């Protein structure tokens, strides 16, 4: 299969600041609403036959 | 292989329709019953078949 290559970002040091989990869930909930209408995009590749 | 149970009375099964795009949104939203190809029919309260 073809997929887009999501490279890693640079491994900046893992600070353990819990607050990051909230802003990750805020973005995931916006992305889950967007997964209704954005489905045509290259970021929405479904596993082809 | 090729043998079953002679009798099964277990009618209260957790039947669902599943929606193929529902990846992210852990939200209690009343989704619009317009986009589905299918719907699960009600069990009638007529005489036992």
Q: How far apart are CA B42 and CA B40, in angstroms?
A: 7
* Helix and strand counts by DSSP (H, E) for chain A: 1, 0
Q: How far apart are CA A2 and CA B49, in angstroms?
A: 51
* Cβ-count burial A31-42 (b if 16+ within 10 Å, e if not): ebeebeeeeeee
A1: CB partners within 8 A, 6+ apart: A47, A48
Rg (CA), chain B: 17
Distance from CA of B3 to the nearest CA of A (A): 35
Say how many CB pairs under 8 Å bridge A and B.
Answer: 19
Distance of CA B2 to the CA centre of its chain: 27
Q: Is B23 on the interface with A (CB under 8 A)?
A: yes
Answer yes or no: are the C-beta atoms of B35 and A40 closer than 8 Å.
no
């Amino acid at each position: 299969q073809l997929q887009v290559a999501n490279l890693p970002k640079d491994h900046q040091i893992q600070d353990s600041s819990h607050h990051q989990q909230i802003q990750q869930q805020e973005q995931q909930q916006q992305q889950q609403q967007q997964q209704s209408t954005c489905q045509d995009t290259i970021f929405s590749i479904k596993k082809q036959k | 292989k090729g043998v079953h149970f002679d009798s099964c009375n277990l009618d209260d099964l957790e039947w669902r329709v599943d929606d193929s795009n529902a990846n992210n949104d852990n939200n209690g939203g009343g989704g619009s019953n317009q986009e589905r190809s299918f719907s699960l029919l009600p069990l009638q309260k007529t005489n036992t078949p």
